[PDB]
Amino acid sequence: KAHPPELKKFMDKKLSLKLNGGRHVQGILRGFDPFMNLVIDECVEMATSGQQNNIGMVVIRGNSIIMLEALERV
Amino acid sequence: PLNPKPFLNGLTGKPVMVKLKWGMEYKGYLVSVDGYMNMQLANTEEYIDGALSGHLGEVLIRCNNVLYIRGV
Amino acid sequence: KEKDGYKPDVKIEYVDETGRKLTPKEAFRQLSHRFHGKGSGKMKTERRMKKLDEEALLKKM
Amino acid sequence: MVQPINLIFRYLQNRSRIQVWLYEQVNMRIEGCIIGFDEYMNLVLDDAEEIHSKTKSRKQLGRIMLKGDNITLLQS
Amino acid sequence: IGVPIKVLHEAEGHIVTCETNTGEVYRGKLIEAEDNMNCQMSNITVTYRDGRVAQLEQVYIRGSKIRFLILPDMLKNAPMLKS
Amino acid sequence: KLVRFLMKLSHETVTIELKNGTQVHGTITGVDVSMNTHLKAVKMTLKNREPVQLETLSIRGNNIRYFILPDSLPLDTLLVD
Amino acid sequence: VSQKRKYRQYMNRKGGFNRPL
Amino acid sequence: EEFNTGPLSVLTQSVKNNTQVLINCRNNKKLLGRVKAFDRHCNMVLENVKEMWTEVPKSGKGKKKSKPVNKDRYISKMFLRGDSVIVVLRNP
Amino acid sequence: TGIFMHGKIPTLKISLIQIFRAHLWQKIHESIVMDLCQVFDQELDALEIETVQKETIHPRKSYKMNSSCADILLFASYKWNVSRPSLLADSKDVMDSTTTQKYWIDIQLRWGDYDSHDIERYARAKFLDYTTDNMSIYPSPTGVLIAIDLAYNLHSAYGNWFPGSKPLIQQAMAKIMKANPALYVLRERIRKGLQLYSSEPTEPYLSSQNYGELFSNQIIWFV
Amino acid sequence: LAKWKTAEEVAALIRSLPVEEQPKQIIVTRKGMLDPLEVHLLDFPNIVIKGSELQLPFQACLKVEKFGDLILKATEPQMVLFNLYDDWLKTISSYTAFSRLILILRALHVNNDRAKVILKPDKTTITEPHHIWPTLTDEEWIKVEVQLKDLILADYGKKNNVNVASLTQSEIRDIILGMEI
Amino acid sequence: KMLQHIDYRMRCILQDGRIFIGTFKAFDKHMNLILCDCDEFRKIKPKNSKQAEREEKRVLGLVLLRGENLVSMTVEGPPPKD
């Protein structure tokens, strides 16, 4: 009965994820599941050390996701 | 080519070391694994932070607390 | 006979209502009480209940 | 329109290397190549190695399987 | 889907605030609020545990990481006193 | 299911230690299937605080670390199905 | 578990010579 | 059937024999005691448990100078909720 | 009691009366029946038994030696495959071409003297006599008889058997003669009557590897 | 008369003491004592009377001025009470307190005056009237403990025709307890 | 047993120590709470203090509390007239 999180507003958008342990990440959304695990293109890591770390396509478990901010205008 | 419950199928009886999320480690021959992947280990020795604090015997390790499983 | 084939783990134990294993002499006394349908006197009742709460107080600390 | 399981599907179609990061243990990271997983997202990984970032230590592991509700990320 | 999730269903498009598991609190106006308390909100200020203030015009917070949700007392009267 | 053993335990004066260390000593009144424990005549000591007398409490069932039952409990006639 | 051994009466029964259940 | 071959065989082989198990719980209190019963969640109702944990006197000097002491308390009958179980261990 | 005295030996008579005072024979027989019924209750599911019934034995049946009656009644919920009557110790037994639903158990205590202390033969004869007896009422023709010689503390059964009954009865009887309170009281009374006791193995004098117990909860004193 | 007299005196003390404080285990240093105890404390079968394969030099107390002077000057027999651990129960464990106490007793037995000067590492430390041993903290206690241990081992090596480095920790422990290797 | 506590002035303890008191009006199967009239506390909570009984306090009004962060309940006073 697990409905998907309502995120076609946020598809192909530049979002900054907040992750669990005070962590942060940035990237383009590419999809989801009903469990809100997000797949991300052009992922820049953006740690608290201050230097920005690009990766690319990553997958983030939805358990660890605190918030999405759409940096791009939806 | 090898999925997780086939993997734990592959190592019921060999010595492994399962690492908890809380930093503990457990070395021994594991006996069995359920659907939730609770673990039954026999002949266990508990490695706290890479140094063993004791031989312990037979332990049940609850599924909500394992971090990984390592085949040694 | 073509018997089944197994080991029966027969365990015979005598316990009180509190789950404590019962001594053989006390077990026999309780058997006799239930058999003759009658019990002890007032003074012995007081003595045994006092011993029971005495052991309770001793072990609680 | 791709999914997370489409990424890990394509990724064990690649068998390249990835680094999983954990729930709240931000210094602890584990590098490996997935051999298999299914829907509880427990992952077996090829010749895994724990890297402690704040000391940059690479403790070798081997054939691993890591539990699903611990991961925060998988970076290629 | 019980009565509090129906209350946050009746808080859609309204001024709402959410305090989060880490301690950040988010005061804005909601856009979508689902069964599992996921909240997509707008015109919103973020207050960290630092005490600082930030603003951005939209956010999407996950439901299980919500600590609680300041609702307006527009909803305190109607109609859930039959509860 | 062992929680069914607890809802047979109505009107017992048990203490409950929670995950926050708070010891709650009181007569249990109701148990859910999720161990949602409703208590009365409550003496609750939140730990690192002085204990407070309260007339009624309702602990959520997830937040229970353990129970503490008294000496006088017949569980051999309670854990049967 | 263990149950109290259900016993019976021999003397001063005021009943039939045979046994009750 | 498979009640007696799974990983909970540590518990259903210890409740049959009524032997004592050692439980490292989540707040690192150690429960030694005999399982009266358990279930899927390891909600173990236990009899005669020694609950052994560690303390320090927590800066009784004012200069933060003390050594950890082993404290224990006895509980007669408990119902340990089994989420806080980390490990259950049968005795050697 | 079931004791038979050949000639009048008044001293032995008074001694035996003192030992068996307070309906001890009846108490022993009743305790043994109840313990066996408890074991049958424990293993009912494995033995595919419907229920265990405490047949209303006559109160004097314990020492009614001329006749007998059934003690325990096993209701099956099925028709078992029973065996020809063979000794409890007979490992090899053949199957009797019959099946039954009700299975009766009889317990017979004896006070065996030197001449006739053969439990195997006594049980065999008593079973083959009572089963054919006209005054012995048994619920079913198929059942077992277990004999206990108190004087020599021996045990053996003879009648029919169904799968599992043999090992169950073997181990039950062993743990019985080991740890039955009634037989314990009888043995203690016999020891006291004979004024024959047993010694003890001194004490594990506290050693350098044993002193660690000194600081346990138990309060200890050094003199 | 003497054996049964001491037995009945200790039995009377046990009787006077409440049941809660009554022991369940009594270990006699002298092996020729347990049997009269077995006879006399029959009324309290709940206790276990045993002998001690190890002997504690409790004459060290008599050698000490306080207990010795009190015993010599006590005209009337009495049941004097003391606490051989000054306040060590609040500082260290009971087992280690007992180990320190027996170390001190054995050191005094082998060499009283030398043991006294060692027990007082300096002449400024004092023992309160309600105390028996000088008030020392963890560091001084450990230093004096090792000093007394080395003195005991030196005496043992001098008297037993053997060196000091050839005994393991098990041997050191059993020797200080009073065992013969 | 919670329908015997509706519309009360309930004292709900969270798992951080952030205490609420307000109108226990609606609850859920997860014990998601809806509380009107609710105010928050951290440090001192009243048993007639020597200084003042209510500081470390904030106005919030009506809250939806998620049941994941919730521990206990206690009524502090009878419900008001309105």
Strand J25-28 relative to strand J48-51, pairing: parallel
Q: In Å, how far from its chain's centre is CA K63?
A: 10
| Closest alpha carbon within chain F to C59 | F71
Query: According to DSSP H, which parts of chain J are helical?
Result: 2-16, 34-40, 59-63, 65-73, 94-110, 112-119, 138-160, 169-177
**J68 CB-contact burial (10 Å; exposed 0-12 / middle 13-18 / buried 19+):** middle
Residues of J in contact with I211 (CB under 8 A): 54, 177
Question: Domain of B22?
Answer: 1-72
CB contact under 8 A, F76 and C56: no
Residues of B in contact with H28 (CB under 8 A): none
| Closest alpha carbon within chain F to H74 | F68
| Chains touching chain K, criterion 3+ CB pairs below 8 Å | E, F
CB contact under 8 A, E20 and A3: no
CB contact under 8 A, C17 and F74: yes
CB contact under 8 A, E62 and A36: yes
Q: In Å, how far from its chain's centre is CA D20?
A: 4
Q: Closest by alpha carbon to I127, among I96, I161, I169, I154?
A: I161
Q: Which of H41, H45, H78 sits opposite F5 (nearest CB)?
A: H45
- How many distinct structural domains can be found in chain F? 1
CATH of the domain at E27: 2.30.30.100
Question: Domain of D9?
Answer: 3-76
CB contact under 8 A, C61 and J20: yes
Inform me whether the C-beta atom of residue B5 falls under 8 Å from chain H C-beta atoms: no
Beta bridge partners of C15: C21
Q: Which of B1, B5, B69 sits opposite D64 (nearest CB)?
A: B69
DSSP state of F16: E
- Rounded Cα–Cα distance for residues I143 and I100 (Å): 10
| Closest alpha carbon within chain C to J18 | C58
Residues of A in contact with E26 (CB under 8 A): 67
CA distances from A46 to A58, D27, E21, E62, I59 (A): 14, 15, 21, 20, 90
Sorted by sequence, the CB contacts under 8 Å of residue I119 that are 6+ apart come out as I110, I112, I147, I148, I149, I152, I154, I155, I156
Q: Which of E68, E75, E76 sits opposite K66 (nearest CB)?
A: E68
Residues of D in contact with A31 (CB under 8 A): 1-4, 6
Residues of I in contact with J93 (CB under 8 A): 215
When scoring B68, B69, B70 by the number of chain D Cβ atoms within 10 A, the one with the most, hence best to mutate, is B68
Residue where the block lists tokens 């008579």: I13
- Rounded Cα–Cα distance for residues I216 and I209 (Å): 15
Strand (E) or helix (H) holding B7: helix B4-10
Q: What residues of chain C have any CB closer than 8 angstroms to a CB in chain J?
A: 54, 58, 61
- Rounded Cα–Cα distance for residues C29 and I185 (Å): 10
Question: Domain of H41?
Answer: 1-92
DSSP state of C30: H
- Rounded Cα–Cα distance for residues J31 and F28 (Å): 57
- How many distinct structural domains can be found in chain E? 1
Q: What are phi and psi of B17, to 5 degrees?
A: -140, 110
Residues of I in contact with G20 (CB under 8 A): 56
- How many distinct structural domains can be found in chain D? 1
Listed resolution, Å:
3.2
- How many distinct structural domains can be found in chain B? 1
Domain boundaries A8-70, corresponding CATH code: 2.30.30.100
- Rounded Cα–Cα distance for residues H41 and C49 (Å): 40
Cα-Cα-Cα-Cα dihedral of J152, J156, J157, J159, to 10°? 140
Inform me whether the C-beta atom of residue F70 falls under 8 Å from chain C C-beta atoms: no
CATH of the domain at H34: 2.30.30.100
CB contact under 8 A, F71 and C19: no
Sorted by sequence, the CB contacts under 8 Å of residue B36 that are 6+ apart come out as B63
Quickly list DSSP for chain I: -----SS--HHHHHHHHHHTTTTHHHHHHHHHHHHHHHHHHHTHHHHT--EEEE----TTGGG--SS-B--EEEEEEEEEEEE----TT-S--PEEEEEEEEEEEEEEEE---STT--HHHHHHHHHHHHTT-SS-B-SSS-EEEEEEETTTTEEEE-S---TTHHHHHHHHHHHHHHH-HHHHHHHHHHHHHHT----------B-TTTGGGGGSSS-EEE-
Inform me whether the C-beta atom of residue C13 falls under 8 Å from chain G C-beta atoms: yes
CA distance to partner chain K, nearest, from residue E26 (Å): 13
CA distance to partner chain J, nearest, from residue C38 (Å): 31
Return the structure tokens found at J119. Answer: 């027990």
- Rounded Cα–Cα distance for residues I78 and I76 (Å): 5
Inform me whether the C-beta atom of residue J138 falls under 8 Å from chain C C-beta atoms: no
Domain I1-197 has CATH 3.10.450.50: no
Kindly report whether the peptide bond that precedes residue E79 is cis, defined as omega within 30 degrees of 0: yes
- Rounded Cα–Cα distance for residues I24 and I15 (Å): 14
Inform me whether the C-beta atom of residue C34 falls under 8 Å from chain I C-beta atoms: no
Q: Which of F3, F19, F68 sits opposite H43 (nearest CB)?
A: F3
Taking the CB of residue I127, how many other CB atoms lie within 10 A of it? 23
Residue where the block lists tokens 């027996």: J102
A&E contacts, CB < 8 Å: 44
Q: In Å, how far from its chain's centre is CA F17?
A: 8
CB contact under 8 A, D64 and B70: yes
Question: Domain of F12?
Answer: 1-81
CA distance to partner chain J, nearest, from residue C50 (Å): 14
Sorted by sequence, the CB contacts under 8 Å of residue E82 that are 6+ apart come out as none
What residues of chain I, 96 to 155, have a C-beta less than 8 Å from chain C?
none
CB contact under 8 A, E60 and A10: yes
CB contact under 8 A, H81 and F64: yes
Decide if I185 contacts C24 (C-beta within 8 A): yes
CB contact under 8 A, E3 and K29: no
